[PDB]
Design a protein around this nucleic acid. Structure first.
Length: 179
RNA sequence: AAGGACUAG
């Protein structure tokens, strides 16, 4: 079995009517849930409008996310790979973006290496290898833009990736202000 | 629309 963080979705924009039974019933169409929670105010027990579901495998998670959009109790819900509590509060931790920064790729990594590595995670719209305008030389990083945010969210659960023989690193692409 | 905990031997 895989790490729990890799099996967990945050589910945003729940109806205040949605319960753990109705959330469980819905998400159980893509696999077994080992945990299901709707967050509630501790005194009023009023729903806070989000919860989490945890599948028995990451393949189940992927199967659910391949079947978006999701709706429960008449609301279109907003599932997202769960961001670990340690990460929450770091700059850009909860951003929703289609673009991924790939660093540590040095000077021999081309567009086609990023394509071949990343296209299993989703549909790629654009790849940009960054070069120094003056020297022409690759600067050791690039950006991969997918057609959806979910590939980016999935990829960045794992910080370190071997890419083209390098010890590469992935980050969600941020504007300078989100940084 | 960002975490509830049989999370005190």
């Amino acid at each position: 079995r895989e790490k729990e963080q890799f099996r967990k979705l945050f589910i945003g924009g729940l109806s205040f009517e949605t319960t753990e039974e109705s959330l469980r019933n819905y998400y159980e169409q893509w696999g077994k849930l080992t945990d299901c929670v709707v967050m509630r105010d501790p005194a009023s027990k009023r729903s806070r409008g989000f919860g989490f579901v945890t599948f028995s495998s990451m393949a189940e998670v992927d199967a659910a996310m391949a079947a978006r959009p999701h709706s429960i109790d008449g609301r279109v819900v907003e599932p997202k790979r769960a961001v670990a509590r340690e990460e929450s509060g770091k700059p850009g931790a909860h951003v929703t973006v289609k673009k991924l920064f790939v660093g540590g790729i040095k000077e021999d990594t081309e567009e086609h290496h990023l394509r071949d590595y990343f296209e299993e995670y989703g549909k790629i719209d654009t790849i940009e290898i960054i070069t120094d305008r003056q020297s022409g030389k690759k600067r050791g990083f690039g950006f991969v833009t997918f057609d959806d945010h979910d590939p980016v969210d999935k990829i960045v659960l794992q910080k370190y990736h071997t890419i083209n023989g390098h010890n590469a690193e992935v980050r969600k692409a941020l504007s300078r202000q989100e940084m």
